[PDB]
Amino acid sequence: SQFSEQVNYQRALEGELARTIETLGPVKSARVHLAMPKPSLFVREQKSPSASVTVTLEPGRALDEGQISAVVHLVSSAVAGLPPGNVTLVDQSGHLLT
Amino acid sequence: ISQFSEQVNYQRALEGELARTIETLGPVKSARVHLAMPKPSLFVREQKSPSASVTVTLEPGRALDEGQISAVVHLVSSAVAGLPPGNVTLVDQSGHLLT
Amino acid sequence: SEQVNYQRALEGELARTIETLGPVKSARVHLAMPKPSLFVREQKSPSASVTVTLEPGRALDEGQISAVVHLVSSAVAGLPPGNVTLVDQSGHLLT
Amino acid sequence: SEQVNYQRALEGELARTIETLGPVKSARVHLAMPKPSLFVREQKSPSASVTVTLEPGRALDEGQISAVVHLVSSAVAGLPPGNVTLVDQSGHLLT
Amino acid sequence: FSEQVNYQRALEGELARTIETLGPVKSARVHLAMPPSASVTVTLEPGRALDEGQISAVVHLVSSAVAGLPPGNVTLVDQSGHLLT
Amino acid sequence: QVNYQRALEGELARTIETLGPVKSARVHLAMPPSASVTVTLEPGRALDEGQISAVVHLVSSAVAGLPPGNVTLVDQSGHLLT
Amino acid sequence: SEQVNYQRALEGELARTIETLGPVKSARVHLAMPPSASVTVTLEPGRALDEGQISAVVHLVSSAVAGLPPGNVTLVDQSGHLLT
Amino acid sequence: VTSEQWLYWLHLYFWPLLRVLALISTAPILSERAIPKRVKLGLGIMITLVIAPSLPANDTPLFSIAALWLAMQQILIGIALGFTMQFAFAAVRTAGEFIGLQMGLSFATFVDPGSHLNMPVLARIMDMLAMLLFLTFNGHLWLISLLVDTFHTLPIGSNPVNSNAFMALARAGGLIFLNGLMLALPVITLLLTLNLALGLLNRMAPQLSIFVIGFPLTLTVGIMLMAALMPLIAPFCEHLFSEIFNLLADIVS
Amino acid sequence: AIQGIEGVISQLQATAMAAGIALNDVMADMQKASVSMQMGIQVRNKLVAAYQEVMSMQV
Amino acid sequence: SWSLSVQTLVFITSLTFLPAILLMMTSFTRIIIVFGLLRNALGTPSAPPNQVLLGLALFLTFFIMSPVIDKIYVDAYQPFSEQKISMQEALDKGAQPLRAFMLRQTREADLALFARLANSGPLQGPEAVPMRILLPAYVTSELKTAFQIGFTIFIPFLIIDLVIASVLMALGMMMVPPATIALPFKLMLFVLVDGWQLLMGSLAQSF
Amino acid sequence: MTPESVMMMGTEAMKVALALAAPLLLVALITGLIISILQAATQINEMTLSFIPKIVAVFIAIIVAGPWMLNLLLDYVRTLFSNLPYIIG
């Protein structure tokens, strides 16, 4: 079904994004969750999509401010109309990096 | 797979992945996420905001930081289209409300 | 049938998480999900009844009562906490 | 048939949880759910009758009667507590 | 849908390919997303810092390869998480 | 179409390499047009200004309605010869 | 496919005739038909093309392409000099 | 005094009336010929009476090409809404007609295409069942509400317009086929197997089969199969209505 | 309005590039409104008739 | 500029010929004939309702006329307000994009036939073809194009029907009608390849 | 009024149709199968002799069970028209 196709697409994008985020030096594993907005049977309204990124770092490999920035840019670009400010980046200890 | 079935399955999958990421968090040993996605009706104006309940089991003595509670809130809220953080409840294994 | 089954599955998962709470040995959740009426003055709203069986002497904390309320309310679209009743194995209303 | 079956399943589960309550040895729940109307006037509130058999001498506390009331009322869409009758094995109205 | 997704995977692949070809660059990873924006991660050879013209040329190539890609929507990052943009 | 695009890219890269100083060429076309050309030069074989101009002309002509100004030429070190 | 193949064949024959011109060792013709042409020639050691030879290359390429305005034919040598 | 400015009232009450009536004449159930014309006109008039005073009044004169552009815009919006809604009933009709044609109910179309002899009675059965379901789910109220709501998104005043958006409605033509296949699928496949079974019988002693034993058996089997399949359309009915509605919401804007 | 003055400057740029009540009034406006309403009704009737003729086709 | 009442009369009179304008001047005939032939191809002459096919053809016609509508808006809708050109010079100026479109979509043979049907010898240039000669020629060209597209649509379904019948005959069956078996396979092929969207894309490309 | 009531309406209606059509269709099918197996046993093959007894059998079917069908369908229609004003919404 189209809905099934859409779910599959969302999952694949999440996977590849996590992949690139891990490949990065300080990152041991990444987990990306995307919330694409939804349609309504009535009323106009955009819901700028949102993303949550959890990173696990290598022992003591703290991410640079520039690094947070670059993660933000990549995730935002990979999602049609994703406003950076709607990307949350968190570490393995629950510290918000963004 | 019915249209309803397709949705329910999507909800279950989202719940699973969210719990997964929450567990990966150091202090968290296991997580359980319940989502309540609402219904549009021709007798109301603003549709009711979705809600989430998150139960975490911590590692022996691994208390969650205020920022840990915050980051959990942010992640769960973002993963649900139009989820107002204030509708995310976070609870431990002893029944203490962390949010 | 599809709806009723959704109800049964949800009730089940909620009871499950509630039992997975230290002091709780078993939980039973009943949901009343109905249809509302507009301009009927005072209508009503979805409601839940939660029965918990505690471990020998494991009394639930006021916070524990609060967290159960939050979880059950959130799991039901538009469930006003005040419509969640929590009761113990002896018939004491915890909410 | 689908509705009648739903009614008898709800009755069964409610009786089940009620028997779980310590003092209760067996429970029997009867629901009277009336015809719905989508006009602008016709409406009637459902009713429940609950018969409990207690363990030898296990009298139900006031709070207990209250919790039974809450559970049964919540499990039935739009069930006004005041329409729940609770009776014991000897025919005493605990309500 | 599949036909489109596959073409995007390809475009991404070829772009990463050319970006690596450049001596300093050891490996490249390109992520696209049209409504467009691009994220480019480069791994450099030990100590092979990219010059300002090097960052510029990468920008130009990626922008041109994507119909209507405004350069300003291309992010270039290194293996350490430094934004070369 | 995609196959036609790939073939054009290949032949253009081919001719660009044929040119002495060029050891290998890579052409990317974006047809809705724009082009990105990466050249690898022979050890120390810097491209002259006229050479850059000729590469531009060839690539622009080979693509229906390609405005030269939308052709980017880059070397193996990431220097924009444009 | 039929068109693309026609384009390739025309390119080949044009390059062929251009090489068959004394000073020319090898030719490469690229056509952009919506037209424009880019011609790269490799000359024999020191065999510079005269003005008329350049003019004749232009004429041939323009004629071989339906509605090709000469001014849209670019001729370049093996060193990247625009003979146009 | 005694002004009663007529042009202001006319311009306030006209264009919303044009849009509401354009939706009425095409929206399903509200566009059925069984309704008397005056009832439809009165419903449009009363809806406009309720809605128009809240909207900002336009001042473009009725004697200008701008008025013609406005009227064309309202007609386009109304017919687009009504037709996008009608697509779901088209899909249900397609599925029903295909189930009926695999019944062998109208075999004369395979030999004389469009020969004035065709009775898609199953298509009509499921079409009217779909209309009953649409009435039950109060889809028409939603249609009226969305007709009102498209103002905030697209005001009466002439506004610029887009393109692939029209394709979307045209591309919705795919849904009629795509969803129809699924509804059938839950029955045609078994019917296919039945026909396959009949083939196995014809691989025995030649002739003496098909057109004499296959037709009644397959007719009865199709009847009881899709009689059992009737409870299945309602979730698919809601799925179809939701698809049409959110496609309309996404593309109208 | 601020946006109104923006529109005024926009129209100036466009020019650059290019380079009590009496019966007499009551009755006249009343008639004008009647005429305009009749014109609107007739034009809509023509449009609706054309649309129904198109949709009553046979493909 | 002539009288306002005469302008109203002419406008309301020209409003009547709107179906004629839609059919003879735009492409609506092509899409409607293509849809009819495609419906005949699948073997179900009433699967999508005639209303739905007509509306889909209408939407396709609106999109494919959107560039011509834009040219009309630039040349006629706008300058009629600024009053640089109005009434005569403009209605004809606004109709000019329609003339360009119909010249683009018309074959030379039909125009030649309709010219020799009107004894219009000195018609030398190709941008001064009168409407009387341009219109029926354009309609005939549209009929030919629609029939060609219908045959191209017919080819794969005919192939599927032939294949199904051949396998039925080879498997030993001599009495089973192949249409009943081949209909669901025709549908699953049409849906799986997503025939509809590619068909509309090709029609838009077909101009 | 509820969609459950509607879909039940369709089901019971079309089961009534099935009950009305099942005797005739089944009689025709049995006659055709019997004639076909007799043809196979006797090695006789003409596509027209199977059409002859089918008409007679199906026409006898109305003689025998026709009153039952007529009484069932009238009862269905009568009950539907009587319950019409109670399933209104």
From Swiss-Prot, chain G:
Give induction info.
Answer: Inhibited in nutrient-poor medium.
Where is the protein localized? Answer: Cell inner membrane; Bacterial flagellum basal body
Of which family is this protein a member?
Belongs to the FliF family.
**Record function comment:** The M ring may be actively involved in energy transduction.
* Subunit structure of this chain's protein: The basal body constitutes a major portion of the flagellar organelle and consists of four rings (L,P,S, and M) mounted on a central rod. The M ring is integral to the inner membrane of the cell and may be connected to the flagellar rod via the S ring. The S (supramembrane ring) lies just distal to the M ring. The L and P rings lie in the outer membrane and the periplasmic space, respectively.
- Name of the featured protein: Flagellar M-ring protein
Name of the gene encoding the protein in the UniProt record:
fliF
From Swiss-Prot, chain H:
The record's keywords, sorted A to Z, are:
Bacterial flagellum, Cell inner membrane, Cell membrane, Membrane, Transmembrane, Transmembrane helix
Annotated membrane topology is: Multi-pass membrane protein
Which Cys pairs does UniProt list as disulfide-bonded? none
Where it sits in the cell: the answer is: Cell inner membrane; Bacterial flagellum basal body
Member of which family?
Belongs to the FliR/MopE/SpaR family.
Q: Which residues cross the membrane?
A: 42-62, 63-83, 128-148, 172-192, 210-230
Organism, as annotated: Salmonella typhimurium (strain LT2 / SGSC1412 / ATCC 700720)
Biological processes annotated in GO: bacterial-type flagellum assembly; protein targeting
Q: What is this protein called?
A: Flagellar biosynthetic protein FliR
Q: What does this protein do?
A: Role in flagellar biosynthesis.
**GO cellular-component terms in the record?**
bacterial-type flagellum basal body; plasma membrane
Give one Pfam family, short name only. Answer: Bac_export_1
From Swiss-Prot, chain I:
One family from Pfam that matches here is: FliE
Q: Quote the subcellular location field of this record.
A: Bacterial flagellum basal body
One Gene Ontology biological process: bacterial-type flagellum-dependent cell motility
- Do the record's keywords include Protease? no
Q: Which PANTHER family match?
A: FLAGELLAR HOOK-BASAL BODY COMPLEX PROTEIN FLIE (PTHR34653:SF1), PTHR34653
Source organism superkingdom: Bacteria
Q: Which family does it belong to?
A: Belongs to the FliE family.
Main localization of the protein described in the UniProt heading: other
What keywords appear on the UniProt entry? Bacterial flagellum
Q: Which organism is it from?
A: Salmonella typhimurium (strain LT2 / SGSC1412 / ATCC 700720)
* UniProt GO MF annotations: cytoskeletal motor activity; structural molecule activity
> GO CC: one term?
bacterial-type flagellum basal body
**UniProt name for this protein:** Flagellar hook-basal body complex protein FliE
From Swiss-Prot, chain K:
Q: How does it sit in the membrane?
A: Multi-pass membrane protein
Which cysteines pair up through disulfides? They are none
Q: Where in the cell is it found?
A: Cell inner membrane; Bacterial flagellum basal body
Q: Which GO terms describe its biological process?
A: bacterial-type flagellum assembly; protein secretion
Q: Which UniProt keywords apply?
A: Bacterial flagellum, Cell inner membrane, Cell membrane, Membrane, Transmembrane, Transmembrane helix
TM annotation in the entry: 18-38, 55-75
Q: NCBIfam families in the record, alphabetically?
A: fliQ
Can you name this protein? Flagellar biosynthetic protein FliQ
